[PDB]
Symmetry: D2
Subunit: 245 residues, 4 copies
C-alpha cells in the first residue's frame, strides 16, 4: 500500500517512516515534515496517510486528504464533538474515503479498554489503578480517565460501588472519575501500566496492560494502515478494526 | 419466571434451590432429585429448568424438557459433538424451546475466556498460568486447557510462540496444549485462579480471574435463567447471553 | 505447654480455644471470659496465657500474670508508649516472665512488613496499595498505615519519592503517610490484601500479602505461645520470634 | 575511593567505568581491559577493583589483587567450593584485604532471594515462577534455580509441598528443583522477572522482582565498592552488605 507520512521529523512520524520502510507489504510514498507542500502526497500516488502533526494543523490536513480521496490514519488529539462533526461533514462529499481517528494505537491498551467496557456491568465493584514513571506530569493518565468514564458509562443504571468508608485520609480512596476510583502510582523503574479491577462476592477479574516502550503504538498504526480500507467514512477508535465491534 | 430444578440433592442443585428462593423476580416451581418423575415439572407449570444431574441421565431429561416446551439451563458436562447433534435434533421439532448448555457459569471465568480469544491474535506470545488449592486432582484444570485450546485456535495461522530455549529441566516450560504453554501452580490457601498472559515487544496484556467461592457459578445460572428465552434453540456456552455488542 | 485463654467468649478467644485443643503438643488449662476471676489460671498451673480481652481490662490482666510468673501472648491493642513503659516496669520485678505484645499475628503480614522495612532504603520510590472488602470502615487499614510509617522511618535521610505530578485530581495520588503514598482499594470479593511496591530505574520489587480468612492469626499466636519462653521480659511485635538470622 | 576496573571494554566493565566516572564520591584510578599489565593498578593507587573478566583469568587476577592488598568486588562466576577454598587461602596472608564474590548484584534480586529464604519455613507451599524474554537460552534462569535451592534448604525438615495431582500433562507442574516447582514463562515484551509464591491455608505471600534494564546491577556493584571495606576477608554474596546478615 502506498503510504505517506506527515510531520515526519516529529517523533511519531519518524518512527512510522522507519516502520513503513522496514515493513514488507507497504511502500513509503512520501515523507513530508513541516515546510513541505501537501501536493507531494498526490504527486506520489499516496493511498493512505499517517498523520500525527500538532492539532492546529490537522484540520487543514484532513481537509486536503479528504478532498483528494486520501485515506487517513490520524493520531493527533485535540478533537472535539464539533471537530468530528466537521470531518464527518467533509466525508459526505467523498464516500470512498476512509478516515480513522484514534486516541490510542497500542493494541494492548485498546483491548484492555474494550474488555473493561464489556465487563463492567457484571460486577458490584470496579476500580482503576494506573502506574507510571515518576516523570509523568498528570495524575491520572489520560488513558486511566478515559477508561474510568467508559466503565461508569457501561454501569449507567447499576448501584454505585459499595463502600462503607467512614473515616479516611484525604486521597486514601483515589480520584473519583464518574463515580469510579482511579488510583495513580508513580514509581521509579516504571513506564506505562494500567490495571482494571472488578469484583463481586465470590470472584474477581483483573485486566492489566503494561507498556514498556515508547514504540508500542507502531503495530497498531500499521494495523490501521493495512485495514483502513475496509470501513468507509469516519471511524473513531481503533477497536472496530480489531474485528471485535 | 417459574423455575424448576433437577438433581436437587446434589451440591449444585441444592444451591440453586436456595438461589431461586432468595431471588425476588423468580419463584421455584419444582425441585426433584434423581428418580422423582419428570411429570412434576409440567404439574407445576415450570417455564425453565436448571439441570446439573449426572451425564447418564441428562439426555433423558433434555428429551422430556424439549418435548414439553421447557427451556433448559444445563450445567452437566460429558457432552460430545454427537450429543450436541442429538439435542440439536430434538429442538428442530420445537422451535420455541431454548436450551443452554455451558461448560462454565462463573461470569468472570467466561469473560476471561472470551477476552483471551479476542486478544489471542494480536501478540507474539501467549501462555496460561493456573493456580489451585493443593487438593485438586488434575493439572492443568479443565478451564485452563479449554482456554489454551481457544487461544491456539484463534492463532491458527500465526507463527508459534517464539522460544529460544535449548537447555532446560523437564517441565520447566509447563504443558503444551496445542502449542500453548500451560503452567499449573498448586498452593495452599488458594481456591481457583487463572492468569492469561500475552506479550509482544513493547507491551504486555494479562487477564486474571480469581474465584474464591464454590458458589461463584450462581450469578451466571441465574442470569442464564433470566435470559434464556431471548435465544431460540440450542446455545452453547454462556458468552452469547452476556450480550456483547 | 499448659495454656490459659482469656476473653474466651469473644471472637478471637473462642478461636484460640479450639486452636489450643486441636494442637497436640499443647493443652488448654483454663478458659475465662470477662469477669471470671484470674485466680483460676494458677489454680490450673497455666504457664502461658493468650490475651485478647478489651483494652480497659488488659492492664489489669497483665499485672496479675506478671505478678504470678505467667507468660503472656497479648493481642489486645490500645497500647501506648506509657502503657508499654508500665508493663516494662512490672517486669523488672520478675525477670523470668516473658511477655509478648503484638499489633498483628498473621505470619504473612509480619513478614511482609519486615521485608518492606529491610527493602525500604535501597530504592528511590515506595508506595503501598491495600485492598479490602467494601465493608471496611477505615482507609487506609491499620496495617497499611503502620507499614507506611516503617518505610518512611527506614528512609530517614534519603530524598522523598521522586514525583513530577503538577496537575491532578484530588486523591489521584492516594494518602500521604509520612511522605509515602498509600492507596486504598475497596472491592467486593476481597478480604484483606496488601501490596508494597518499591522501584528504582531498571528494577522493581513488590511484596504482596493476601489474607483469605478471619483466622489467619492462629498460626502466629500458636507460634508465639510455643516460643514465648525463649525471650525474657517484654517483646514487642512478633518478628523477633520469627527467629531471623 | 580509588577504583580500578578490569576487563573494561567488556560490557560490564565499560558500564562500571561510566558509573564510577559519573559517581560523585569515587575516582576512577585505572581502566584495564585485556592486553594490559596488572602493575597499572598499583601504579595508580587503586584501593578497590571491580572485576568481571572471564572465569579462566579471574583466579590469576584475584591472586594479584590479594597479594597487593587490593580490595576486590568480583562478579565473575564459574566459582566452585574448591576455588572459594583457594581465595580463602590467599586471604590468610593478607588479613586487611576484603574480597566480595557474588553471583548477583541487582539489589532487588538479592533482597527478593533473601526474603524467600527467611519466609520459606513458615508456609505449607512454595513455588517459583520466572518470566523472561523469548530469547533466553535456558529454563529456568540461573536465578530461579538458585532461589529454589535456598527455599528447599530453608525447608529442610518440613513436609514437602502438599500436592494431590494424580493425572497431568508432562510439565504441567513445572520443573522440580530440590522438591520445589519452578515454572518458566517466556514471553515477548519481557526482560527478567521472578515471582516467589508461598501459601498456607488462610494466607499467601508473594515476592516479585522485575528487572527492566541490563544495567540494574550497577547500583549494587557501587554499593559493594563503597562498603567492601567494612568486612575483612572473603564475603560471599551481596546480602551481608545490605546490613541484613
Ligand atoms: Mg516497505
Ligand atoms: Mg423467589
Ligand atoms: Mg491439646
Ligand atoms: Mg567519579
Amino acid at each position: 500500500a502506498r503510504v505517506g507520512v506527515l510531520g515526519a521529523k516529529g517523533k511519531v512520524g519518524a518512527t512510522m517512516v522507519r516502520a513503513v520502510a522496514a515493513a514488507d507489504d507497504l511502500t513509503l510514498s512520501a515523507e513530508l515534515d513541516a515546510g513541505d507542500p501537501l501536493s507531494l502526497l498526490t504527486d506520489g500516488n499516496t493511498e493512505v496517510v499517517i498523520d500525527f502533526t500538532h492539532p492546529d494543523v490537522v484540520m487543514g490536513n484532513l481537509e486536503f486528504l479528504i478532498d483528494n480521496g486520501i485515506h487517513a490514519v490520524v493520531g493527533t488529539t485535540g478533537f472535539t464533538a464539533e471537530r468530528f462533526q466537521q470531518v464527518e461533514s467533509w466525508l459526505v462529499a467523498k464516500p470512498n474515503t476512509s478516515v480513522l481517528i484514534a486516541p490510542n494505537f497500542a493494541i494492548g491498551a485498546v483491548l484492555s479498554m474494550h474488555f473493561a467496557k464489556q465487563a463492567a456491568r457484571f460486577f458490584d465493584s470496579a476500580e482503576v489503578i494506573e502506574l507510571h514513571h515518576p516523570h509523568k506530569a498528570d495524575a491520572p493518565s489520560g488513558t486511566a480517565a478515559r477508561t474510568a468514564k467508559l466503565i461508569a458509562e457501561a454501569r449507567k443504571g447499576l448501584p454505585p460501588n459499595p463502600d462503607a468508608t467512614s473515616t479516611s485520609l484525604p486521597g486514601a480512596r483515589g480520584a473519583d472519575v464518574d463515580g469510579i476510583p482511579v488510583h495513580a502510582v508513580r514509581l521509579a523503574g516504571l513506564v506505562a501500566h494500567q490495571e482494571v479491577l472488578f469484583g463481586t462476592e465470590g470472584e474477581t477479574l483483573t485486566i492489566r496492560h503494561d507498556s514498556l516502550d515508547r514504540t508500542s503504538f507502531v503495530p497498531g498504526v500499521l494495523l490501521a494502515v493495512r485495514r483502513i480500507a475496509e470501513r468507509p467514512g469516519l471511524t473513531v477508535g481503533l477497536e472496530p478494526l480489531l474485528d471485535l465491534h
